[PDB]
């Protein structure tokens, strides 16, 4: 019951993940604690280094394992390359985020996946007690830099209302399509 900032983590520094992390580092003025995950720690160090020298308004923290990324973050946002990496990071790993989700966490998937992967992810997140939103993004990295991305959030509506101030930092057209799997 400590009045503190929101621990927000971005998993995956790829084509679209690093402008999402840069928008969260710029446009969040001392309101969140930013975590940055990558498989190689040098890439996360590079992204945090560029965010520090370009001038960010929040403090950042690098991660290389999913366990500390699970135990630190209140909100997790995944922007990966393919469905196989997202299925490994969410379900197939031993330290995966949804399988070891804490009570009250919110996990948003921006990687476009199949329907059964999102169904099993939302089912296991509801089984663990956490929340899962699948919001596949539409746009270019230049459009991600300008904050104009298209989001189709499926999941809980109250969780969508909670996550709208984070979604409005890198996306303008954010729609709530309904239940899990609609986006």
């Amino acid at each position: 019951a400590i009045k503190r900032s929101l621990n927000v983590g971005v998993v995956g520094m790829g084509n679209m993940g690093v402008p999402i992390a840069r928008n969260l580092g710029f446009k969040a003025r001392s309101a969140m604690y930013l975590q940055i995950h990558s498989r190689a720690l040098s890439k996360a160090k590079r992204v945090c280094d560029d965010l520090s020298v370009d001038g960010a308004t929040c403090a950042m923290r690098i991660h290389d394992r999913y366990s500390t990324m699970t135990k630190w973050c209140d909100v997790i946002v995944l922007a990966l390359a393919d469905v196989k990496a997202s299925r490994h990071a969410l379900l197939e790993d031993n330290e995966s985020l949804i399988m070891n989700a804490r009570k009250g966490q919110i996990i948003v998937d921006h990687t476009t996946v199949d329907a059964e992967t999102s169904r099993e992810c939302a089912h296991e997140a509801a089984r663990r007690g956490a929340y899962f939103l699948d919001a596949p993004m539409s746009g270019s990295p230049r459009a991600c830099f300008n904050g104009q991305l298209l989001l189709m959030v499926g999941g809980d509506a109250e969780t969508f209302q909670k996550m709208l101030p984070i979604f409005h930092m890198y996306a303008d057209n954010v729609f709530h399509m309904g239940e899990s799997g609609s986006g």
Partner: protein, 348 residues
Amino acid sequence: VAKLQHNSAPTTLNFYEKSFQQLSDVQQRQTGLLIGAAVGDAAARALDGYTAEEVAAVAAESGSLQDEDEDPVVFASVTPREHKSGLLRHHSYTFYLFSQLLRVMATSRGDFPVQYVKNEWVATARAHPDCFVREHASLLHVLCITMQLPVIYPWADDSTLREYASGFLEFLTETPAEQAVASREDVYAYTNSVLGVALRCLQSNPDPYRNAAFMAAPGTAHVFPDDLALYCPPALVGSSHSRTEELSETDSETVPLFPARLLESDVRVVRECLVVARGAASFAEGIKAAIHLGGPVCQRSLIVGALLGARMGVRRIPISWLSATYDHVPLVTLALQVAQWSWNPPHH
């Protein structure tokens, strides 16, 4: 601690919100007597002239509060009756002469004679003759005007303050006739006692209502509450011989026109204002208890709003009440010029 920026949240709620942090602890109590009287007079404006039963009928007809709405007594949405002349639809006639005295005080850069403000006050009474004959030479209207006099130098004693105020107290009780008042000295003595209360409030005195009763004017026990009336000095026997000279005329048909309200009817209003402002926990709750009494309610909340603002400063004033005041743009600017120039007057 800081939240996500959402729904276009404003940085500051008022123009002078962070300017009150840039004042001293005495300068927050110097401006508290000025801005706190402006907030209190504007809050009880819509219920001016209402009785105590009509004020309670306003709070009874509106029983829907979402806990974000304030008391419907404060800044009421009721329809006024005379509904007004030009500037007076947000503040009373007593505040018009209060705002003109503050404007002279800011440009005079310190203490100033009464002749600087004589032409400002008679132009208002010439424009509003109906509000002039209702409130001239009364104890409530004279005390609300000269309330802002210890802002010039709050560390002064009662001997220096009553000497400076006596030039202001004589013109407010002077009329162009030979039928001046029922008593010149009783309006002076009751005013000088409550001016000691505000002088102790700007000096951050422990129990300012008790210590103002000891150094009060003699014969002014009725303006203080009953527990503090034992501490007031009694009236002089030479002053009681002057009361027999007023009875030696024996002219009950020849009642003086000024003031319109009785003097003893005004002592009960200031005594009720000192009871409310004593046990008031905050600036907002003390004003809400002052408008619930009714009657001359703009002058009620001008006494309570000044005395409470002089105690807990302008930072304890709710900033949404200041943003709703109509003349808060010039008056807080004029209140900053008084508090800055009070410690170095250029003349002396």
